[PDB]
Amino acid sequence: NEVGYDDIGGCRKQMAQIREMVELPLRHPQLFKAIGIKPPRGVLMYGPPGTGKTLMARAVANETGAFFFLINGPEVMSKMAGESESNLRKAFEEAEKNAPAIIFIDEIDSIAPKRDKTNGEVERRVVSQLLTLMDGMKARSNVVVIAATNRPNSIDPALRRFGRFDREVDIGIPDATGRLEVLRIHTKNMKLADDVDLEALAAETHGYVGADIASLCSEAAMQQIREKMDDSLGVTMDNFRFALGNSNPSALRETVVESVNVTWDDVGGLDEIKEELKETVEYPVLHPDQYTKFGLSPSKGVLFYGPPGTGKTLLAKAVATEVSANFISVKGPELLSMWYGESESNIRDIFDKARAAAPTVVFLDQLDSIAKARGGSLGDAGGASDRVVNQLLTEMDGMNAKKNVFVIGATNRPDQIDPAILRPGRLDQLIYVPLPDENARLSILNAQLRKTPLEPGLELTAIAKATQGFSGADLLYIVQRAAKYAIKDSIEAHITKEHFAEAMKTAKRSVSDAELRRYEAYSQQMKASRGQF
Amino acid sequence: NEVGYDDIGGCRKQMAQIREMVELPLRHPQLFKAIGIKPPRGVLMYGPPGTGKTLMARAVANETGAFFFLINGPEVMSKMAGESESNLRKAFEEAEKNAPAIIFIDEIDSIAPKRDKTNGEVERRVVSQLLTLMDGMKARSNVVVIAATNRPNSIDPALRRFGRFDREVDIGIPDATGRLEVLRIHTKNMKLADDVDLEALAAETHGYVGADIASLCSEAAMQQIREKMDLIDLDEDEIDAEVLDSLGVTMDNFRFALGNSNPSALRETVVESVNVTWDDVGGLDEIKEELKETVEYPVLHPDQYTKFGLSPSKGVLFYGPPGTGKTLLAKAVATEVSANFISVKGPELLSMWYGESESNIRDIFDKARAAAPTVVFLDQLDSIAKARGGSLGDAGGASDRVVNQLLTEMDGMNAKKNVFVIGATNRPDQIDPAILRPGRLDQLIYVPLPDENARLSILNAQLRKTPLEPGLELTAIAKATQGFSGADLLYIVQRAAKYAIKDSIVPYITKEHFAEAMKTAKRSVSDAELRRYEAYSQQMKASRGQF
Amino acid sequence: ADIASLCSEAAMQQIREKMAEVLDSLGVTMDNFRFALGNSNPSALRETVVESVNVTWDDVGGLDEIKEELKETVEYPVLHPDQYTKFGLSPSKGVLFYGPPGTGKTLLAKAVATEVSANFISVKGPELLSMWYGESESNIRDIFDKARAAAPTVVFLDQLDSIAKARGGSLGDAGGASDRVVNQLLTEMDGMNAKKNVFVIGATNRPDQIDPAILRPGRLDQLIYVPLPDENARLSILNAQLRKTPLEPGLELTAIAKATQGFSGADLLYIVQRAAKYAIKDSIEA
Amino acid sequence: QIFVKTLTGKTITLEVESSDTIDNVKSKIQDKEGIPPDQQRLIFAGKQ
Ligand SMILES: Nc1ncnc2c1ncn2[C@@H]1O[C@H](COP(=O)(O)OP(=O)(O)OP(=O)(O)O)[C@@H](O)[C@H]1O
Ligand SMILES: Nc1ncnc2c1ncn2[C@@H]1O[C@H](COP(=O)(O)OP(=O)(O)OP(=O)(O)O)[C@@H](O)[C@H]1O
Numbered sequence A: 001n002e003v004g005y006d007d008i009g010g011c012r013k014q015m016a017q018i019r020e021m022v023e024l025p026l027r028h029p030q031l032f033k034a035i036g037i038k039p040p041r042g043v044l045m046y047g048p049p050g051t052g053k054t055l056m057a058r059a060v061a062n063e064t065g066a067f068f069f070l071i072n073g074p075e076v077m078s079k080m081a082g083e084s085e086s087n088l089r090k091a092f093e094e095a096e097k098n099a100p101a102i103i104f105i106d107e108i109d110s111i112a113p114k115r116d117k118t119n120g121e122v123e124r125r126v127v128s129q130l131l132t133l134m135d136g137m138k139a140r141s142n143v144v145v146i147a148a149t150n151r152p153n154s155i156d157p158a159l160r161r162f163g164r165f166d167r168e169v170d171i172g173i174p175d176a177t178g179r180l181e182v183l184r185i186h187t188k189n190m191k192l193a194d195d196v197d198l199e200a201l202a203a204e205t206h207g208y209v210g211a212d213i214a215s216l217c218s219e220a221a222m223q224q225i226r227e228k229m230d231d232s233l234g235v236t237m238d239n240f241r242f243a244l245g246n247s248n249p250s251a252l253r254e255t256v257v258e259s260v261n262v263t264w265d266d267v268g269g270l271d272e273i274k275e276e277l278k279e280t281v282e283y284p285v286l287h288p289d290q291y292t293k294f295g296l297s298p299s300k301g302v303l304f305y306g307p308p309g310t311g312k313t314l315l316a317k318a319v320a321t322e323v324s325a326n327f328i329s330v331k332g333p334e335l336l337s338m339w340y341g342e343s344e345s346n347i348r349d350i351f352d353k354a355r356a357a358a359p360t361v362v363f364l365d366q367l368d369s370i371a372k373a374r375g376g377s378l379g380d381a382g383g384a385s386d387r388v389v390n391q392l393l394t395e396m397d398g399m400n401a402k403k404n405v406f407v408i409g410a411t412n413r414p415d416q417i418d419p420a421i422l423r424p425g426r427l428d429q430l431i432y433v434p435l436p437d438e439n440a441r442l443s444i445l446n447a448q449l450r451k452t453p454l455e456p457g458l459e460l461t462a463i464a465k466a467t468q469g470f471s472g473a474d475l476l477y478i479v480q481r482a483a484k485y486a487i488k489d490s491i492e493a494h495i496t497k498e499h500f501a502e503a504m505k506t507a508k509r510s511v512s513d514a515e516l517r518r519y520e521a522y523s524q525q526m527k528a529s530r531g532q533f
Numbered sequence B: 001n002e003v004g005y006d007d008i009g010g011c012r013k014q015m016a017q018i019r020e021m022v023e024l025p026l027r028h029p030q031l032f033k034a035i036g037i038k039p040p041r042g043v044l045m046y047g048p049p050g051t052g053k054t055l056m057a058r059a060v061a062n063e064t065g066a067f068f069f070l071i072n073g074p075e076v077m078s079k080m081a082g083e084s085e086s087n088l089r090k091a092f093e094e095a096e097k098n099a100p101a102i103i104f105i106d107e108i109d110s111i112a113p114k115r116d117k118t119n120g121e122v123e124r125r126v127v128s129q130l131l132t133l134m135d136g137m138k139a140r141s142n143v144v145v146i147a148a149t150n151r152p153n154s155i156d157p158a159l160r161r162f163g164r165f166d167r168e169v170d171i172g173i174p175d176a177t178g179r180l181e182v183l184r185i186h187t188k189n190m191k192l193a194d195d196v197d198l199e200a201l202a203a204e205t206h207g208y209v210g211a212d213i214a215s216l217c218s219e220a221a222m223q224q225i226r227e228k229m230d231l232i233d234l235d236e237d238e239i240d241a242e243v244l245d246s247l248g249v250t251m252d253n254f255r256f257a258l259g260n261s262n263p264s265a266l267r268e269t270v271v272e273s274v275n276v277t278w279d280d281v282g283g284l285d286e287i288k289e290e291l292k293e294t295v296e297y298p299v300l301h302p303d304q305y306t307k308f309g310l311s312p313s314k315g316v317l318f319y320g321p322p323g324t325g326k327t328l329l330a331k332a333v334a335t336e337v338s339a340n341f342i343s344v345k346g347p348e349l350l351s352m353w354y355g356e357s358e359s360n361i362r363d364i365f366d367k368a369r370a371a372a373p374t375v376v377f378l379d380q381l382d383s384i385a386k387a388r389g390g391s392l393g394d395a396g397g398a399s400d401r402v403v404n405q406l407l408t409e410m411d412g413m414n415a416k417k418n419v420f421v422i423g424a425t426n427r428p429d430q431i432d433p434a435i436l437r438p439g440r441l442d443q444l445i446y447v448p449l450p451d452e453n454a455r456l457s458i459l460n461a462q463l464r465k466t467p468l469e470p471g472l473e474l475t476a477i478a479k480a481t482q483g484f485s486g487a488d489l490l491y492i493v494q495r496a497a498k499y500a501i502k503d504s505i506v507p508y509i510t511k512e513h514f515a516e517a518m519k520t521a522k523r524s525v526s527d528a529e530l531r532r533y534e535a536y537s538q539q540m541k542a543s544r545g546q547f
Numbered sequence C: 001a002d003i004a005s006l007c008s009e010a011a012m013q014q015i016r017e018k019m020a021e022v023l024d025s026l027g028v029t030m031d032n033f034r035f036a037l038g039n040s041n042p043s044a045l046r047e048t049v050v051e052s053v054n055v056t057w058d059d060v061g062g063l064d065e066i067k068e069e070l071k072e073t074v075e076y077p078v079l080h081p082d083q084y085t086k087f088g089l090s091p092s093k094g095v096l097f098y099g100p101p102g103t104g105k106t107l108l109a110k111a112v113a114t115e116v117s118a119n120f121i122s123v124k125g126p127e128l129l130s131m132w133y134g135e136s137e138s139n140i141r142d143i144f145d146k147a148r149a150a151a152p153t154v155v156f157l158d159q160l161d162s163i164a165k166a167r168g169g170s171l172g173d174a175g176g177a178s179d180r181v182v183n184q185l186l187t188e189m190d191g192m193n194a195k196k197n198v199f200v201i202g203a204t205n206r207p208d209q210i211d212p213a214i215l216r217p218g219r220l221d222q223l224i225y226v227p228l229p230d231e232n233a234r235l236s237i238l239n240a241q242l243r244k245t246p247l248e249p250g251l252e253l254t255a256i257a258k259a260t261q262g263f264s265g266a267d268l269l270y271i272v273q274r275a276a277k278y279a280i281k282d283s284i285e286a
Numbered sequence D: 001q002i003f004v005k006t007l008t009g010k011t012i013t014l015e016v017e018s019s020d021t022i023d024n025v026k027s028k029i030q031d032k033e034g035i036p037p038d039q040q041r042l043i044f045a046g047k048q
C-alpha cells in the first residue's frame, strides 16, 4: 500500500540528484569518506504547489524503508506558543528510534518569512528553537531533514547556511514528455478505448501540473459515466476533449521555463544569421574553453531592429534548440507596465531563478526606451520613467559568468538610440532583420497551409511578386481574410481559388514605405560605421 | 418533519446535476471498480442568500436513506478552540461505521474566510484541523461532505484543490415557472380566495428569491388580519371562534404586499440574460446578417470552424459617429446568440475599492467555466482610456491596475468555454494601442449614421411604454436633427411630456406637443466627424495593427 | 565559512564521478574545484557587492601623467599618516577628470582604490534624480556615514553634466528644482569629515560649462586633462587580454596606431575583442 | 512633487484567564506542607 520510483515522473534531472543526495549518507556512512564524514543534510526543495513534493519525498523513503515523519507549517504555527516549542522537540526525538529516518518539514515560508514587517520576540521564537536543535542532532544520528516550501526568497536567509540548509532543489513544470509520463502513471488502471490520444493533449497543457492531470482524468471519466446509465463501460477521447474545454489553468502568473523543439526550418530564409548565432553561444555551452584559451568573454545582450512584429517571437523560440537549453519569454512593454519595485525586483527574481534553471535564455523586446526614459525627474510616474535606466546598466553586467544566462533583445527604430552603451563587448550582436524573401515567406505559408486542406490548383507565388510592403507576418491575414468565405457556404446549406481575389490587395498592410527607406540607412553603414552609427 | 423532492422547486435542472453526482458513490460503488478512478467526496453549493440550500441538503439525505448529520456554521464558533475540534472529530467517526452517510456542513465562510487580508491566529486554527482530517481520512467508506456558502471566492483558496473540494455547483434564481412552484408549497395551508390567480403572481415578482416569496405571502396574510381587525378586536381571548373561517387572502393584498416590500437579492445585475431584439431599434440591417457570420457560426458548428486552423472570432468593435446608437445597442447584443451576458462599465463596476476591482472580472471567468456560456461587453472605450493611460512617443504602454487580469485570461480560454468579448467605442482615435493587438479585434463591424430618414421607426418602438395619442404626427420629428439618436430622442419626448404637471389643479397628449417640438432641432453629431470614419470603414484593413 | 563547504562540495562530486578500492577517487582534482566554483554560492553575492577587485596598473597602456598625479592625493595620507600632521595641513581631497568618452578615465579609478585595498562606490549623475520633490538630497547624505565607518572607502561621482551645468542659465520650473539639488553636494564637499580618508573622484565630459563653485580649491583642484592616450603607448594596452600568440605581432598594431590621431583608446582595444570573429572562429572546427 | 499619507489602527487585547484543570487539583490535595519542629503525626495500631 506504498509507492515507489515508477509512481512519479517528469522530474528526472534533479530527481537523479535527490536519489543520490540523501541515499549516500543513509545507505552507508562508512563508504562516504571513512576519515571525515560531511553529510550536508537539510535539503531545501521548492516550487509551485501540486508538483508532488510530498509524493517524490515518499518515493525515496519507501524504496529504502525510511520512516516518513511528516509535519506542516500552519498546523504547528496555529497552536500555543509553548506547545509548538514542545511539539518540535517531540518531532525530532524520533531521529534515534527509527534511524535511518526522514523528517519531512513543509511550509517553512509561513514559519520564517521575510524580516521587514515584523520585529517581535514570539515571531522569532519558533525559528530560534529549530536553530537550537539543528546543532543538537550534530552527533551523526544518520537522519536527513527535508524542507519543502514555494520559493527560496521567502525563507529567512539566516536559515540558509552551510551546516544547516545548503542543498537547493528546484521543482518546476514538466516538459512535453513529462506530463505524458504522468498521464501514463494516472491511467495505469484507467480502462480506456483504442481511440484515445496521448500526445496532442499532453503538449497542449502549458500551465498545468500532474495534480491538474489528476483532476483531468477524473473529470473526463465522470463525464463518461453521465451518458451511460441515463459491464457496459468505455472511455473515448471525446470525454478528454470535454475535459479540455472544462480544464482549470492554475499556473498562469509565471514565465515559461519549459524548453521547446521547434526547428530553424520552420521560418524561411535568414540562414546567414542562424550560423552567426550558432558560432557564438551554442559552442561555449558544451565547452567554454574557447573563450579562455585566448581570454574573451561571452555575449551579454543582442539586438534586433527593422520592421516590427515580423515574427521575432518564433525566432526567440528557436534559439533554445541548437543550444540544448530552456527559454524565458519576458514581454516587451513590461518595462513600463511594471510599477516601482516591480520594474526592479521582478526582473531580478527571474534572473536568480534562471541561475537555478541553467542553462537557459531570456527574451526581451522594445529596447528603444533607453534613449527616451533616461532623465527621469517628473513627479507623476513611478517605476516607468526612472527605475529602468538606473538598473539595466548594472543588471546586464551583474551576471556570474559561470552558469551562462543569456539575454535576447529586439527593438524597432535604432536611429534615435545613443551609441554610448551600444558599443560591442556588452551590446555586440546588433542585427538588422530584413524584409523576407519570396521563397522565405512561402516556406512559412506552406507551414500556415499545413493545418488546413487545400486543392493543388492554387498558387502562392502570384501574390509574392508584388510584395513591396508585405512581410511574412503581414501576409498572415491571408488565411483569415480569404478563408472566411469557405466556412459560410458549407454550414448554411444544411479551399478553392475563388477567394484569392478578395485577399489579393485588401488583405493586410502594415509595413509602410517611409521607414522602408530608413531600414537601410544604418544597414548600408554596418561595415564602416559598425561601432557607433 | 422530513422533506422530499416535492418540497423544493425552481432548481429542478440544477438539482439533477447534484442528484447524479452524490447518488453514484452512495448507491452503486461498482462503477469505481470498473473505471478505476476516485469519485469526488466534497461538493460546494453557493449563490445568493435565501435560496433554500439548507433545505436541499435535507431533501437529498432523507430520500436516499443515508445516515444524515448536520454541522451548522456559527455553532462551531460559539465555542472555544478546544471543544470545537473535539466536536468535529466525533462527527466523522460515527459516519464511518454508518456507511453510507452524508456529513453536511453549513456556512463555511464563517469558519474559512479569506485569510490573507487578516493574517491572524484563529483564521488557520479550525481550518488546519479540518484539512488534516478531510485529506487524512482513507477507509473507502464512500461518505460525501457537502459545503454551503454565499460566494465561491470568499473562502480560503486552498480548499478548492483536487481530492477535497472539486465540483462547484451554482444555485441560481428560479424562473417564472420556478417561482410559481415555490408559493404552491407554502400555500398548502393558506386558505386563499378563488380570485387569486396562480400564474399572475409569478410574473409580478421578477427577481424574488424563495425566501422573499415566502415573506411576501405572510405579509399579505397579515394584512388580512388587519383588514378584519375592526370586525373582532383583541380584547376577547378567542371567544368568537366562528368568523375565522371567512379569512381568505384575496389577490389585492398581494398587490399591497408588493407595494411595501423590496427586492433584497437584486443588489447586482441580471445573472441569466437580457431580451431586447434587433427589431426594437429601427434599421441597421446591413450589419444584422454581417454579425450572423462571426458570433453564431462557431457556436453552432465547432468542428468546421476550427479544423481549418482559423482562430475563433472572439472580439468585435462598434465605432463611427459618437453617441449614435452604439450606446443604445448596449443591451441589444445578447439576444442573438441568447447566452449569458453581464455588461461592464468604467464608473459602474471597476471603480470600487481596492481588492474588489478585479473580483468582478473574476465572476465573468467563473461564468466562462462553471456557468458557460458567457458574453462580455464593454462600452465607451474612450472614457476608460483615462484609467488605462495613453502611450506616448515610441516607447509606451498602458500601466493600468485592471488590464493585467483582463488581457491574460481572455486569451487563455479556448473556444469550448464560449468566451465572447464585445467592444463599442465612440471615436477610434481615442483608443489605447497597448490593448489593441492582432488576434483580439480582427473583426470590423462599422456602425454608420443611424438612418435619419428612417428614424421614425426608431421612435416608434420607443413610445410603447406610455398610452399615446392615436393621431400621431411623425412627419419631420427626427429627419431634421441628423445628430440626435435614440438616446437623445428621449429629450424630445421629455419636451412633449413634462407639461403634464403644469396646467393642473383634461388633455394629456396633443398633436401640438410634437408639432411645436421642432424649435429645438439641433445637431450634436455633426457631419464633419462622420465623414472621417466613413472612409475608414473601407481602409481599416491597412490599419488593423497598432492604430 | 563558505570555504569550509567548498572542500565538501567538490568531494561529493568525486564520489558521484565514480558512483583504495573506492578511496582513490577521494583525491580531488583541480577542475572539480572549478565545478564547485561553477555552482558556487558567493557570500558577497547574497548582498550588495562592495569588495575590492583584483585590477592593477599593468592592464592598461599609457596615461602615466595621471598615474604620477594620482599616487599622492589618496595614497600618501593612508601610507604615511604622520607626514601631513607634522605640517598640520591635510592633503587635498578630490580629483577631477575631463575629456572624451573613449579614454579610461572612469575605468582606471578602480585601480586607485584597490591598490591600498580601499572600497569603491561608483555613482552616476543621471542615475538618481529628483523624481518627486526633494527625493535626492536625502539620497546623497545617506552614503556619507557608511563611507567613513567601513574606511578606507572612496566614492566615485560620475557624469556631472546633469547637475553641474545649471547655475544661472536654466530659469524654469526644473531650474528652480535645479537650484535645490546642486547645493546639497556643494555643501557636502567641505562639510564632510576629511580625516576619515574619504575621497571624491570625478570624470565628466564637456569641461566648459562646469559650475564655478566646484572648481574651487578643497573640492576639485587637480585640473587633470585626460585625452586619448599617446600613439606610441597603444601597444601596451593589449598586454592584458591576450598573451599567447604563435606569431608574436606588435609592429602592425603600432602601424595602424601611428596612422592617425583620431583613433580612440577603446576602439583599438576592440581589434582583439573581435578575435572570436577573426581567428577563434576558423580554428575550432576539429 | 507630491506626497502619500496614510494612518493606522490597532486592537489591543481580550483575555479570559481560564486555568486550574481538575487533574492538577486532585494531585494538589494529596501532599504534605511541613511541620515546624516537633509536631509528629503518628501511627496507631489495634484490632487484633
Ligand atoms: N511531478 C509531479 N507533479 C505533480 N503531481 C504528481 C507528480 N508526480 C506524480 N504526481 C501525482 O499527482 C498528484 C499531485 O498531488 P500532490 O499532493 O502530489 O501535489 P503536491 O503539490 O506535492 O501536494 P502538497 O502541496 O500537499 O505537497 C499526486 O497525488 C501524485 O501521485
Ligand atoms: N425548492 C425551493 N427552492 C428555493 N427556496 C425554497 C424551496 N423550498 C422552500 N424554499 C424557501 O426558501 C427558504 C430556504 O432558505 P434557507 O433556509 O436554505 O436559507 P440559506 O441561506 O440557503 O441557508 P444557509 O444559512 O445554510 O445558507 C425557506 O425559508 C423556504 O421558505
Ligand SMILES: Nc1ncnc2c1ncn2[C@@H]1O[C@H](COP(=O)(O)OP(=O)(O)O)[C@@H](O)[C@H]1O
Residues within 6 Å of the ligand: C060, C061, C062, C063, C100, C101, C102, C103, C104, C105, C106, C107, C108, C203, C229, C237, C264, C265, C266, C267, C269
Ligand atoms: N587605456 C585604455 N585604452 C583603451 N581602452 C580603455 C583603456 N582603459 C579603459 N578602456 C576601456 O574603457 C572602458 C572604461 O572606461 P570608459 O567606459 O571609456 O569611461 P568613459 O566612457 O567615461 O570614458 C572599459 O570598458 C575599457 O575597455
